[PDB]
Symmetry: C4
Subunit: 326 residues, 4 copies
Amino acid sequence: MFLKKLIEAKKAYTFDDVLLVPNASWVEPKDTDVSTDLAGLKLNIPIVSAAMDTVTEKEMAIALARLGGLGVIHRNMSIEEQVHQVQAVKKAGYPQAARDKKGRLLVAAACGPHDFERAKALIEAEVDAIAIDCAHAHNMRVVENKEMLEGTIKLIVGNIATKEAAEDLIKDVLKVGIGPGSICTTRVVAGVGVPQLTAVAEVADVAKEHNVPIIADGGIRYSGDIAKAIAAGADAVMLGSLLAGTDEAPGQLMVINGRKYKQYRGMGVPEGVEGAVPYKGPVSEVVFQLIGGLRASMGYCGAKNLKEMQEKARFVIITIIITNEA
Amino acid sequence: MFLKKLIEAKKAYTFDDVLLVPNASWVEPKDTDVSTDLAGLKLNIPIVSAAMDTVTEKEMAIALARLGGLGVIHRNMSIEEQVHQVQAVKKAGYPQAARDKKGRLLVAAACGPHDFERAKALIEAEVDAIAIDCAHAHNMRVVENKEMLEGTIKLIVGNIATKEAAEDLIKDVLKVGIGPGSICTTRVVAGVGVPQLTAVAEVADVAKEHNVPIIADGGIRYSGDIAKAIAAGADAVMLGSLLAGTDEAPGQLMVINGRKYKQYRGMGVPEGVEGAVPYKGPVSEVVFQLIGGLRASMGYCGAKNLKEMQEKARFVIITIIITNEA
Amino acid sequence: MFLKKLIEAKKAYTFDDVLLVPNASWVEPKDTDVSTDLAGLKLNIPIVSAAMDTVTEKEMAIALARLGGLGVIHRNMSIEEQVHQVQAVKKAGYPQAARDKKGRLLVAAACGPHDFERAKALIEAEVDAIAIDCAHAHNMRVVENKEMLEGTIKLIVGNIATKEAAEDLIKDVLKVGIGPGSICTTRVVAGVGVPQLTAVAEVADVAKEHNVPIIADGGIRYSGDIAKAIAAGADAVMLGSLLAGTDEAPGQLMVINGRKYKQYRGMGVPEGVEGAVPYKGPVSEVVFQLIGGLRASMGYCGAKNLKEMQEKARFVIITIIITNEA
Amino acid sequence: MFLKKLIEAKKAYTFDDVLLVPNASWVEPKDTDVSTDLAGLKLNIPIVSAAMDTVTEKEMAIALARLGGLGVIHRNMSIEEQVHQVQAVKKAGYPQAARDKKGRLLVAAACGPHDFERAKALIEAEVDAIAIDCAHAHNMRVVENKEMLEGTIKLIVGNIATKEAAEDLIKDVLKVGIGPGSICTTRVVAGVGVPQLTAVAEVADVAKEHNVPIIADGGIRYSGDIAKAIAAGADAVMLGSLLAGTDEAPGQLMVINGRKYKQYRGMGVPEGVEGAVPYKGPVSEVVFQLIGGLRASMGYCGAKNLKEMQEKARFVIITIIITNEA
């Protein structure tokens, strides 16, 4: 019973466990296609704002949608205010923009799994996606809940990290993230988690069979991790901290030892810490590096688009003064 | 002979080796039941004071019994004094209290494995549990001890970490702890130990078959470790350091770099160091966080009580400036 | 598909993963032969300059060729200038010198995989080797690439880290290095790499069957790593950082906390950082230590030459104030 | 060939890889017998001085022989002087003393594997053991070695770390130590080594079959490591650094930040660094702690003597402010 748990417990993998092995390549990074199609939503880069009151309000959602990415407007706010922030994006030269059929920068919003009133006004606020957004979407009341899909345009649900959780959310997009957060403390606090490669891998072997997109939430520290996230079955990454500290991040100007910062903190005992991160200036750059690394990665793998990166990328398992690392 | 030891030595696990994988859940943390029944002793939280002259005298035993937990009054003292401290708890609105059939806050006491005189006065001091308390309870004289069970109400024995040690203590409660102590130095000093998950797992596959409770002693650094301790067959955790530094801890006020501390040290060449830990204020909180994490964990696992947490919890094996982590 | 990548991903090894196990030995280090024959090029020590504008221009190539080693003159410069630097070595008591059939210190030069004009002037500049030198030589245009072998004397190609990449470069010498660089950031930046023992091992099981030499590029931090590099199928090591900071290194005098330095940086989003390393004085020593360690290693393995070191060396896998470590 | 080395390389273990699992015990530490019989030499504690010019001259050899242990008088000195130091011990209430049949404190001396003249005067200096003492005793000239056993009383040979090396030294005592030294740099310098448990295990499965004692040389940082050393087939430990810094150590008084030190350095490119270690005062204590830990360990294992510790000890494999850790 108890020893069987340990004798037979399988081994799970994160980003720093693996490396991508380079294949023969007909592709150069200039020639890549990083577009991804989250259930009809057509992104031109595979990046999604983490719906945190430190990461994504209107400025982010506009800037990132403009870039081909997707803002999830957070739900630590009034409906009057959320709806206002949805229609601010809809009411905003930008060549690789992500846009609804009405030309408008597309956007999404976070809704909690018992909040039906917010989900309505959202729909009327012409939101492109609703994110049923909680800590344990495999809570069986959350699964029930169907009722938000009777309400509807596209329904993203999370977070989950299991084969079984993905089966039960039948039901438009899934996100995976139980533990991965940089400022998340779920593992410390409740002993609970799955290393994010194994999590995304397992969840995607279910989800692929129904052409259900995976967004892979938390633990993305580098461009390389994004290339791993996708090689294991992600269709996009949900970035937050790497996008915290930028100008468009709604986090609070801070100073310590004279240097600029902006806060970054958790949503919810808490399962998320309060902190600060370096001021980064305009998100654009931050995105154009991440994408720039994913292309170079795509070139190493001989992948001209994210589909081929999913079908070709293979893993192997692994165990001076610096002056300008840029 | 010698190479066979290494070729065939099995691999053992601690807390930082595993994570709990979340299941489908009908349960929320508010709905949880963390009660545990240590051989008729009915605790309303699965927490046990470590019998150390830095951790548990009367103030702790009262406060923790009040909380649903259980004080083991330490044996680094005279019998006259131990017996006085037993009856102080018996002679002390507190809704989730752990209480003997006479309404009184229940309590326990540590007795060494050759001290028959102390074990008697204890019985007459109306103690609810005796802890036959030593470094190696699988010492075959200790096993002999029978004689303290002829003396008797409930008999807790420890510490042990093997299948075989559990067989020989047939015999009311077992505790496991050979190595785990934070300030314990058994591994350094005598090369000896078993990682505490494997220890509890193995010991519990014996003990479950006789409905013998496991208390899991040492190495609990976080609430998450408690949820792991139980998922591997613990019925309660024995906390000490995490409860050191609190107000009710009988350890000594200290200062270094202006900040408050209280000492924490080992019982007994020594197999335990002298140290200090931050002043924490009233134990209550410290307990209500640990329990708060165990509930959130129980909610992740779909466990409404500690039984289901034992039957459902599964493991997987694994390899920014902060401003308020509370 | 995705979980299969992780379930079945093999495990790869670097230098700090292994140790060489000592065999019975008829050999002492004085009696060793560290010569290596890179496709007719006859080196008297198995060391190759890394073609970096911080590591190898004329002074290095002369000094190292004199030592029995081989300078690759870098390609971050004009052809007029590269050709001048080739013929400077040709136009330069030195007992274990590496020398072309015309008595002259032999040398090599880096050429990019689309630069046909540079490859020509090179040939006319009487260069002994051309290094088709890029980040991903398994780019299928690079393989095409043939055309530089129709141009020709000896053709070194790199970098590659796979069985399959080695097959396609049929095809005179191979070098392996995808990730290993100290100041390389390929793994961070594009998630891509192979631990250098596995890389060299795999590449050499192909290359040996056609008597194709391996140069093993990057990650050499100690003399011991060189002995491992060769035991896994290298025929030489390509050193750079360990040779940076020396007098003959064309890197820039620097100071920080009063101590001498010279810069060291990457060739090419970038996949290489800017940095500095301690001033070392004349390369000779640096080389005579590395070689000195490789001999002591060769003596431990019972290997009188690099062939026997390849055929005998076996691995095992592994998991005070200092005042003069020399 | 090359990939086969890595695919099939076995995994080797050091001290920090394992823990000893406690068995049922009829034994208390007071009741233990730590005597060991190195080929007729009868030690009353299993400790051997490392023959280093920083560790063992006359003062050590007397003090340690008095304790039941064995001094190897080092060979970084003239024969006139070595012989003088042998007969100083012979020419020196001490209840557990190690003593030759003539009542005299027994002792040993280091001799290099080509130095026949030193080995003679030694014999005439009435030395109890000769240590054929080099870096690679599996050098096939060393094996030849025979000639020093024709010279003879007891012959200790080292260092070796392989099954095969032990076969060839047929054959009076073996010591194992290729890599383990704290100040040894063999792994760095020549890439060569075997983790010391696997080394001792393997060497002892040969040596036991001929009743050939193992001394286990280097890497002993704690009392616990000694208990592991023996459980894997050692018959004694060869201590050096842990015995450096003591009063009887012939190393040089030093100071840094006001605190007392004595140097400690290597014998012999070098394969040993120069350093210093804290002043410890009289060796006795240092020994009575190590032994004190080995007894507590022996008590945990149910071993009344070193034989039973070899036959019972089993391994498992593994992955606050301090004020007085004594």
